[PDB]
Write an enzyme that holds these catalytic residues in place. Sequence first.
Site, PDB file in Angstrom:
ATOM      1  N   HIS A   1       0.810  -1.215   0.000  1.00  0.00           N
ATOM      2  CA  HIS A   1       0.000   0.000   0.000  1.00  0.00           C
ATOM      3  C   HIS A   1       0.847   1.270   0.000  1.00  0.00           C
ATOM      4  O   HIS A   1       0.397   2.310  -0.470  1.00  0.00           O
ATOM      5  CB  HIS A   1      -1.000  -0.002   1.155  1.00  0.00           C
ATOM      6  CG  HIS A   1      -2.157  -0.920   0.931  1.00  0.00           C
ATOM      7  ND1 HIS A   1      -3.470  -0.493   0.919  1.00  0.00           N
ATOM      8  CD2 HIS A   1      -2.195  -2.251   0.689  1.00  0.00           C
ATOM      9  CE1 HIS A   1      -4.262  -1.521   0.690  1.00  0.00           C
ATOM     10  NE2 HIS A   1      -3.513  -2.602   0.544  1.00  0.00           N
TER      11      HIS A   1
ATOM     12  N   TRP B   1       3.330 -13.557  -8.778  1.00  0.00           N
ATOM     13  CA  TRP B   1       4.392 -13.798  -7.802  1.00  0.00           C
ATOM     14  C   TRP B   1       4.212 -12.972  -6.530  1.00  0.00           C
ATOM     15  O   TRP B   1       4.420 -13.472  -5.426  1.00  0.00           O
ATOM     16  CB  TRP B   1       5.747 -13.535  -8.437  1.00  0.00           C
ATOM     17  CG  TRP B   1       5.998 -14.435  -9.598  1.00  0.00           C
ATOM     18  CD1 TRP B   1       5.463 -15.681  -9.803  1.00  0.00           C
ATOM     19  CD2 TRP B   1       6.834 -14.167 -10.726  1.00  0.00           C
ATOM     20  NE1 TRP B   1       5.925 -16.202 -10.982  1.00  0.00           N
ATOM     21  CE2 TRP B   1       6.766 -15.296 -11.572  1.00  0.00           C
ATOM     22  CE3 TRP B   1       7.640 -13.086 -11.104  1.00  0.00           C
ATOM     23  CZ2 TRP B   1       7.469 -15.371 -12.772  1.00  0.00           C
ATOM     24  CZ3 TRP B   1       8.342 -13.164 -12.293  1.00  0.00           C
ATOM     25  CH2 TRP B   1       8.249 -14.299 -13.117  1.00  0.00           C
TER      26      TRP B   1
END
Length: 329
Positions: free
Chosen positions: A47, A164
Site C-alpha cells: 500500500h 508472484w
Amino acid sequence: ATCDDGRTTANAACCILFPILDDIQENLFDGAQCGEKVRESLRLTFHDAIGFSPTLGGGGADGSIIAFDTIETNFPANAGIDEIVSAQKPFVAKHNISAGDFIQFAGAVGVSNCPGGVRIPFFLGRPDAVAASPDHLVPEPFDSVDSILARMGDAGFSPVEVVWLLASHSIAAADKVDPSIPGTPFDSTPGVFDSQFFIETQLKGRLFPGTADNKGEAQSPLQGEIRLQSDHLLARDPQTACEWQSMVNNQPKIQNRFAATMSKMALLGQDKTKLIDCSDVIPTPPALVGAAHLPAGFSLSDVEQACAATPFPALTADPGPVTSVPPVP
Ligand code: HEM
Ligand SMILES: [Ca+2]
Ligand SMILES: [Ca+2]
C-alpha cells in the site's frame, strides 16, 4: 564490515539495523512470531509502494502512507490500513531510519518469521517522503483483471510478476471484505508461506463463509476461508492462469520469485544504486511446515483447470471429511 558484537555485514551502515530488528521482533511482532502484525506489515509494503505512476504521480516506496497518513489512510482502497500505520509510527520516531525504509524493513523481517518464508533483499537509504500518493493507485478486489493488470503494469509489473507478489495472500486474512467475519484467511494456512493459496483459489467456489454478495468477494470452496473476486479471476485468466498453476507445490519458485519481485516493489520510486545493500541483516526463515494438498473431501475434479498447456498437478487430499478453516487471532 564488522558490527560492535563481531557480526559481519557487507556495509558498515547496516549495523544500525540490528537494534531496530531486535525492537520490532520483541515489540511489534510479539517475539518474532508470524502473526497479525507481520501480515499487516507485509500488506503495508504494497500500500505504500504501489502509489507510483509515470503518468499519474506518486513517490512509490517512500513512506508516504505514514508521513501523510491523514491523507492516504482515508483513501477507500486503504481501508483497514491505519492500525498498522499507527503501530509503526512510534518505531520510526524512536529509530533513525526513514519511514520508507522502516516499512520495507518491517515487511522483510516479518516474512522471515513465517515458516516457508524467504529472505527479501533489503536496501537502506530511502529519502523522507516528499508528497502524498495520489488516490486511486491501489488496486481493489472488485476491479477487473484487466484493470488490476493495467495498474500493476503501470507501476512496472508484468502479469506474471503480479502472480508472484500475490504469494503474500498465502499469509493473509480479511477484516473488511465481509465485516461480519473479520480475520477470515485467504488460504487454510495463513501462518505458513506456502502454495495452499494457489491451490485453494483454483477450486470451484461452493459457498460464502459469511454473507453473500459482498463487493470484491467471490464464492469460497471452504467454510472459514474467504476468496477475493480478484484472486478468483486471476487464477482463471489466460494472462496469469498458467503462472498461477505453476506455483502449486513449487515452494522454491514461490520463494525465489516472491523475493525478487518484492525487492522490485520495495524500490519503486527509488534508485538502487543510491541505496546500501543490507540484505544480510534479514534472518533465516523457519523451514516449510506441511506438504501441498487438496483440502480434505476434495478431488482433482473439484479443480477448475485454467491452464490449457499443462494439466493441474496430481495432488492428494488431506484425509477425512470436509472441514472448516479456523479464523486467525
Ligand atoms: C494485486 C491486487 C491486490 C488486491 C486486489 C488485494 C486485495 C486485498 C484485500 C481486499 C485484502 C483484505 C483487506 C481486509 O479486508 O482486511 C488483502 C489483504 C492482504 N494483502 Fe492483498 N491485494 C493485492 C495485492 C497484494 C500485494 C502485492 C501484497 C504484497 C505484500 C499484498 C499483501 C496482503 C497481505 C499480507 C494481506 C493480509 C493482511 C492481514 O492479514 O492482516 N496484497 N489484500
Ligand atoms: Ca508511498
Ligand atoms: Ca499459506
